[PDB]
Amino acid sequence: YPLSIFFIVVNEFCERFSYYGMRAILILYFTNLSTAIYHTFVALCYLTPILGALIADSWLGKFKTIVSLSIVYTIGQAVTSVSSINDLTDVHVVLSLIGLALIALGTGGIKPCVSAFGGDQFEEGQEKQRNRFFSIFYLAINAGSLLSTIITPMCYPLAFGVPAALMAVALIVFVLGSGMYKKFKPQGNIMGKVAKCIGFAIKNRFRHRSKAFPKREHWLDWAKEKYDERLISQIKMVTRVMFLYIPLPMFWALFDQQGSRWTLQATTMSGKIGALEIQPDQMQTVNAILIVIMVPIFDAVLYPLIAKCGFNFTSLKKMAVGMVLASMAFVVAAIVQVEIDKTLPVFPKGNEVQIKVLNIGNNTMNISLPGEMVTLGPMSQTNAFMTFDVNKLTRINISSPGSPVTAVTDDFKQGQRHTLLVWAPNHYQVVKDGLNQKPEKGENGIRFVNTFNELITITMSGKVYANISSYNASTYQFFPSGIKGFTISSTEIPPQCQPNFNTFYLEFGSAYTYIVQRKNDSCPEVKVFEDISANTVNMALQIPQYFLLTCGEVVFSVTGLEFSYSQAPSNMKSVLQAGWLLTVAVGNIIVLIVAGAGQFSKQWAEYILFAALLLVVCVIFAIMARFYTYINPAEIEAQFD
């Protein structure tokens, strides 16, 4: 029996491995809305499966569609790669756009058919062996995911071309197994038959308003009037099973959160392990690492042990329990979410304005501000931002001991942090900061200030600041952690001056401002001032919140596809798979429905998003589980004719 299986398993592992490659690249290629864009196309890929089962069981069977959809899948990836080269080498965008739609079909028509195809090989009441396959099969899906991430860092033609090539390798091997596959063909228009049967029955029910209206079957009492009984039996099994899925999709909206929402939180939690220098975006991989080792344990020890004590868990029992751990997983995040709040600074909102003042002169200056004054010595700054109201910024006076007063006639934008630089009694400057949140992806911004009469130019690892006016600062640019070297160039600088310099360790999430000042020998000097503190909380603390979800998703997901396959009738095995996959499609809509948040504190969203909904669904789902939909032995009922 294993012979024909290996061709199938290696195909999915090889296939889905390449599939993940396109994911990270796509968002980078085009560059809150990232949540929509990331989720929108994720759901889109799961609408196509609708086109999968219909064609598969109503036309050419299952073997043909896999081969056909495999070819069209590769073309989409290949076309997108070359079309991208056409735009840069030489309307053009239209070529790239078409690839996306073509790529989706393969991603859609393959997932349902492949799963149903594997199960067919098991026929001799091989409950344990067929289940072993599904446990093995799911372990293969994440195997590709793990390898995809590690190779991604190590070009566009190869970035797109190379992943596409593997699918061809996967495609070729699957063909070789044709002589060994156990395959079945359709015997008519199954989809059409059901369509007509449903319409006639309900139409008949509409008739006889008060004549034998009480139905002994909610729908079948009327369908039987024209159609074959065993035909009614098959639809009856599928109709009941599909009902149980109504409460399921909410859960998938609770698992996807790790893709973006948690990764966003990883930005503010970058306390780096001493041993290594893990990056923020790599945390998602931790789900892959656990799942490969966790899956064998459950099948190996846990399930046999549970049997010994006589708990006798059923598929329904596990699925209901599986949702519990996922729910409890999120509340752990909320604990971590509130914890970080003790360290992150506060940013202005709307009509609020935050002000920072930095003195770079050689003499102390006195600053007059609405309802308060600040005196800052040479090369000194305020240790924290000062918040103010836009309307309350009425009078601003600047003076130095023994110097005339100087007013400020500039303007400030509400909702933007502003910095005031003063170097002489009547010489000041107003500059915008640009950033009003934690830096994206964890990198730390850097800028510079000009004090010399002439323009200056500075370069630092592929990024250049040039033509900077005197007593005016540039805008921030972001660099990774560690230590970076930089060089300066300016006409006023004599050649003999040394422009080579090095920085201190950067860590993650910090924001420092440099200052350039003249030495007695005309050589420049470098001073550093902080604006935002470095991230403190360690990143490994996300492991707790991760383990429960992955441990809970192994018990849930594995049973989901297996239980969907068993209850399906021998004729419409693939159709139900669409229902199962269709569950995920709805899920991403709910998170998309979030749109704006009622308030700002993220801790609220992390909590109500699961507790008020997921648990309520669980109890509601349990009620439906009380109606023993598992009591259907789909394998034997057909034997009754």
Numbering used by the authors: 12 to 42, 50 to 108, 120 to 183, 197 to 683
Anything the authors wrote about it?
PepT1 belongs to the solute carrier family 15 (SLC15), also known as the proton-coupled oligopeptide transporter (POT) family, which consists of four members in eukaryotes: PepT1 (SLC15A1), PepT2 (SLC15A2), PhT1 (SLC15A4), and PhT2 (SLC15A3). PepT1 and PepT2 are best characterized and mediate the uptake, distribution, and resorption of di- and tripeptides in the body. PepT1 and PepT2 are secondary active transporters, which are energized by the inward-directed electrochemical proton gradient. On a structural level, human PepT1 (HsPepT1) is 708 and human PepT2 (HsPepT2) is 729 amino acids long. Both polypeptides consist of a core transporter unit of predicted 12 transmembrane helices (TMs) of the major facilitator superfamily (MFS) fold and an extracellular immunoglobulin-like domain (ECD) placed between TM9 and TM10.
HsPepT1 was captured in the outward-facing conformation, both in apo and substrate-bound states, and in a substrate-bound outward-facing occluded structure. In this transition, salt bridges present on the intracellular side of all previous outward-facing states are disrupted, and a new one is established on the extracellular side, leading to the complete sealing from the luminal solvent. (C) Further bending of TM2 allows the interaction of H57, S302, N630, and D298 as a crucial step before (D) total sealing of the extracellular side and switching to the inward-facing occluded state stabilized by the salt bridge R185-D323.
